[PDB]
A = this chain, B = another copy of it.
Amino acid sequence: QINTEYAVSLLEQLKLFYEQQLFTDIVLIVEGTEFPCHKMVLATCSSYFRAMFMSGLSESKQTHVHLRNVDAATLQIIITYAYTGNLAMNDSTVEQLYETACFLQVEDVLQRCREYLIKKINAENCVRLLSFADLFSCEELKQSAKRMVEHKFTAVYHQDAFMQLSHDLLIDILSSDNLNVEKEETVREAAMLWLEYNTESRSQYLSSVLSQIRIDALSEVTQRAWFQGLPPNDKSVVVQGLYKSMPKFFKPRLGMTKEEMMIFIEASSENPCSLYSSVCYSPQAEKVYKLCSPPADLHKVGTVVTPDNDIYIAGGQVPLKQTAFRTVNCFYWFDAQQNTWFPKTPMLFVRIKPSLVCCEGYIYAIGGDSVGGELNRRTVERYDTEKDEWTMVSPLPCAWQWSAAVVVHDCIYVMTLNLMYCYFPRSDSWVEMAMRQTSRSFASAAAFGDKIFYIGGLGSSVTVEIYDVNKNEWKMAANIPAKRYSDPCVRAVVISNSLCVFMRETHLNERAKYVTYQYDLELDRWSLRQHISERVLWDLGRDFRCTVGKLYPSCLEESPWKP
């Protein structure tokens, strides 16, 4: 191999020459700023300077080149990267950095900024990044922007930059089958408002934008509104659209295929070659669709589903390369369509079984057997979904183990064996709450409306303690009627605007039975909503978690397994 010591010595000597200006022969003249540099470094880094000097043109012998349509700071950072390899990339100058990299055709900085932008893609810059990837040919960025823009924009459709988009880009966006919309009318009104941004600059594109939307809205309202905005005496558009909506037979999209499903993680692996797996139950389809494995079989993790219906994974441990397990603070995000886990910004401290709770767009991970264990062994930390970073919050006053947390009334409610503390995001403080009369642990709670339903606790039992936020008191309702001499595995969840329970029971010398019940809020009784047949759902285990979310049956595949 090439001697790295001599390579770094040569590089540092060249950078010293650059700083001291000894062997510089070519100077870059940009907006009156002198940039003394060498030809060898520029040729090695950029693919434009190699065609600027070794070309035989008038600049081959000229020692002063007036490089135009560039920026001084961008050129300076590119030159210093070419001379030392350090590329300091902030969150603002990456746009002009990519512009100058494309202008100068430098592959290394182009790849680096492409990776930075593939990491930086978020909701508030999705349309801007897609427009940037349309301006400069970049297929990876274009595809990532396609996916993220489709999802987040069809969720939001309010960005100001969406109005200033090319016709081809909008045709690609609207005609795609990856849009995430609960209805087919929101895309219609989004297209209408985009068209009405201008009057005559969009008339020619009117015949094309309607060609990608289904005819179910091409004969109903929002056709006379276009006639109102039609240019005067234009008889080539009204009669055109009058007899035009014959083709494009109505085909349902993919965004209207989200159903309230119970996502399960760390289920019992069917094949003994793997430790655990992830499955999902369909309360409506009455089937069990398989889910992608956790990233690097990440066990002992926590789940959260934001009001925007997004799944996240935090904490967990990976078997170190017989008992062998090491805890890692890696963070991941689940793609609802690609059926894969996209990595995100990792946490600061590793966790085991963390309680992920979403509130005000922030992901809160409370506790989880942190590595530190100092006097603040109860330190909790939130995540920024806008800036893609983690921020510490007010620590929990008391150290708790095997706890659960929910969000009610824009506040974080973490529950332990007998104590409860409410966190105020506005003031970053903890307030003492009501005290339970029973010592129970290893249970889960579901936030339904303005009440907290702590179900089960210790196997578990059928004890239920209902807490009211407005009343600040713990009261008993009833006990779930289950078979005696059994060990039910209770799982509290909210579904169909009602509090249902996923309770798996096992009898003596008998296999586990799956059945869910609907708890009557006013009657204080668990009614049999549906019985899960064992012909579709097999054993899941004991350390499995359940959460409420929506998934697409089309993108996912049915799990092939014998009843």
Contact = CB atoms under 8 A, between A and B. Distances in A.
Interface of A: 1-14, 17, 22-23, 25, 38-41, 43-45, 50, 53-54, 84-86, 108
A50 to B, nearest CB: 8
A2 B86 contact: yes
A158 to B, nearest CB: 41
A41 B41 CA distance: 11
Given A53-B23, A54-B22, A3 B86 contact: yes
A396 B309 CA distance: 78
A22 B54 CA distance: 7
A10 B44 contact: yes
A537 to B, nearest CB: 50
Given A1-B11, A23-B53, A40 B43 contact: no
Given A1-B11, A11-B1, A43-B23, A85 B6 contact: yes
A25 B108 CA distance: 27
21 contacts: A1-B12, A1-B84, A2-B12, A3-B7, A3-B8, A4-B7, A5-B108, A7-B8, A7-B10, A7-B11, A9-B108, A10-B44, A13-B43, A13-B44, A14-B40, A14-B44, A17-B40, A23-B40, A23-B43, A23-B53, A38-B40
A22 B25 CA distance: 16
Contacts of A40: 14, 17, 23, 38, 40
A1 B39 CA distance: 20
B13 A8 contact: no
A8 B17 contact: no
A105 to B, nearest CB: 15
Given A1-B12, A5-B108, A23-B39, 18 more contacts: A1-B8, A1-B11, A1-B85, A2-B12, A2-B86, A3-B85, A3-B86, A4-B7, A4-B8, A6-B108, A7-B7, A7-B11, A9-B108, A10-B85, A14-B40, A25-B25, A38-B40, A40-B40
A8 B11 CA distance: 9
Nearest to A22: B54
B11 A6 contact: yes
A450 to B, nearest CB: 55
A541 B337 CA distance: 77
A4 to B, nearest CB: 5
